[PDB]
Amino acid sequence: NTVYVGNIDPRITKEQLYELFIQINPVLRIKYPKDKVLQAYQGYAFIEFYNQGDAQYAIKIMNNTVRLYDRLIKVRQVPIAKLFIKNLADSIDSDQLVKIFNKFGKLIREPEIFYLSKLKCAYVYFEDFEKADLAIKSLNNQLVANNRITVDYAFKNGKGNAKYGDDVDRLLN
RNA sequence: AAAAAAAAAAAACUAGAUACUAACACAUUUAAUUUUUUUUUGUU
């Protein structure tokens, strides 16, 4: 219900802000942070309306509309499976990783290739712990691109606890 | 070009520095009456 405001003159006072934005919509509160060191505001604010619709409408109407001391005001709005894999082949592109792990599970993000020791390793993000269980079951200690690869859980000691299965199960559901 | 959604000082010990509170108390106090204490030993 709160909208961000920016490009504010430090000479602007909370009174002037309120008088401005009440024209658009009823404003529940205005948090307009000040530096208590210098007693000087930082040129931005947070304006909390009563509901969301007033916030969105205010964003639409008041963005880049008004110049306060020539300054044009800005108005704006404002946990997953992971697998460590070791001994990868240098011929394996991240896209080839994607094609490998898609059949096992849907990737929430892209894998991350990093070198340890020289030693090609990667992190693979799955949306499911069970799909990752399939990826480990089939892919663990398996020869691809003429190189034996090891698939396990990435450390945090690693993922795959019981609470991990429960809360990941919930985040999926 | 951007936004940073509002909390930090200590504590202890030992000494030293300085404000301050409480209509606090400060020259009256003595004519009924308990410190008045002795191995009793004051005689028509």
From Swiss-Prot:
Q: Which PROSITE patterns match?
A: RRM
Principal location class = nucleus
Q: Name one GO biological process term.
A: U2-type prespliceosome assembly
* Superkingdom of source: Eukaryota
**Cellular component GO terms, alphabetical:** nucleus; spliceosomal complex; U2 snRNP; U2-type prespliceosome; U2-type spliceosomal complex
Where would one find the signal peptide in this protein? none
Pfam families from the UniProt entry? RRM_1
Q: Does the keyword Chaperone apply?
A: no
Q: Give the RRM domain ranges.
A: 1-78, 81-156
Asked whether the keyword Transmembrane helix is assigned, the reply is no
What are the recorded GO MF terms, alphabetically? Answer: RNA binding
What is said about its interaction partners and assembly?
Answer: Interacts with RDS3.
Further details from the record: Present with 1240 molecules/cell in log phase SD medium.
User: Its biological function?
Assistant: Possible SF3b-like factor.
Among PANTHER family, the record links this protein to:
SPLICING FACTOR 3B SUBUNIT 4
Entry protein name: Protein HSH49
Q: Source species, please?
A: Saccharomyces cerevisiae (strain ATCC 204508 / S288c) (Baker's yeast)
